[PDB]
């Protein structure tokens, strides 16, 4: 309830958690997490990476 990384839980702060959160997970994660999707947003690096279902 701090605002940390869903992936390394790391503070947040001036991250902006009002759109730093994956689309796919509902969890925050840091600039450094995220995998730029091909499409028109990002993904957590456990949404974006190589796996489905
Ligand atoms: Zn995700
Ligand atoms: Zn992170």
Redesign the pocket.
């Known amino acids: 309830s701090d605002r940390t990384?869903a992936?390394?839980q790391?503070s947040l702060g001036r991250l902006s958690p009002k759109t730093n959160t994956c689309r796919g997970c509902n969890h925050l994660?840091?600039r450094?997490?995220r995998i730029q999707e091909s499409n028109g947003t990002w993904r957590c690096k456990v949404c974006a990476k190589e796996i489905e279902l």
């Open positions: 990384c992936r390394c790391e994660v840091c450094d997490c």
